[PDB]
Amino acid sequence: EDELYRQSLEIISRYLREQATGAKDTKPMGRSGATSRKALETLRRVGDGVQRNHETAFQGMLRKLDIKNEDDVKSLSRVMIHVFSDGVTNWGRIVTLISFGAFVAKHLKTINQESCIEPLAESITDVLVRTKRDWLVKQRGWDGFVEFFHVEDLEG
Numbered sequence: 001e002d003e004l005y006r007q008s009l010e011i012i013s014r015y016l017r018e019q020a021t022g023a024k025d026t027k028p029m030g031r032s033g034a035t036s037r038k039a040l041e042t043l044r045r046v047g048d049g050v051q052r053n054h055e056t057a058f059q060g061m062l063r064k065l066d067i068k069n070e071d072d073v074k075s076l077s078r079v080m081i082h083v084f085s086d087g088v089t090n091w092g093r094i095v096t097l098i099s100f101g102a103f104v105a106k107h108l109k110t111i112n113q114e115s116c117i118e119p120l121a122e123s124i125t126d127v128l129v130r131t132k133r134d135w136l137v138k139q140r141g142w143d144g145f146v147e148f149f150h151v152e153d154l155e156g
């Protein structure tokens with residue numbers, strides 16, 4: 001019924017799990033599957049670049065956060081609200097939010113805390129959707145995300 005939340009959670013959870021495990025989830029998407037598929041494909045293309053372009057800053061922040069367990073992962077919501085929500089919103093900042101989430105998810109895999117990845121994805125989704133719904137709706141949601149990052153085919 002809250003379709004934006006459900007769709008956001010599915011896209012973000014899939015990207016974080018895919019980043020952590022290195023395998024695609026072959027299960028069908030829920031509702032709005034065509035857009036969700038394209039959003040995940042976009043998030044791959046763009047987020048993978050973001051994590052490399054900001055490698056030094058990402059590594060620095062990860063080290064600072066010292067994520068070891070469920071309690072540490074739970075504390076991240078407050079930090080996301082502080083850093084992401086309290087600023088002007090644009091798609092770039094949303095991708096950085098999600099891309100750093102994937103960076104944290106990979107870290108969780110490396111320390112054998114894979115069970116924390118889904119709660120992490122839920123926390124990121126809560127912060128994004130519950131603090132930026134108005135902006136997301138005005139920007140056409142995940143359809144807008146896909147449109148914004150669409151790259152035209154090169155001739156020849």
Ligand SMILES: C[C@@H]1CCCC[C@H](O)[C@@H]2CC[C@H]2CN2C[C@@]3(CCCc4cc(Cl)ccc43)COc3ccc(cc32)C(=O)NS1(=O)=O
Nearest residue numbers: 054057058061076079080083084092093096097100101104
């Ligand atoms: C140009 C900027 C990107 C480069 C700067 C990156 C920055 O130095 C920190 C390295 C992690 C970045 C801090 N966080 C990361 C943070 C804040 C730290 C905790 C956290 C945890 C998770 Cl699971 C996901 C995100 C986050 C909030 O999300 C951010 C959203 C936008 C920007 C930065 C955010 C953010 O600053 N995005 S931006 O304006 O596009």
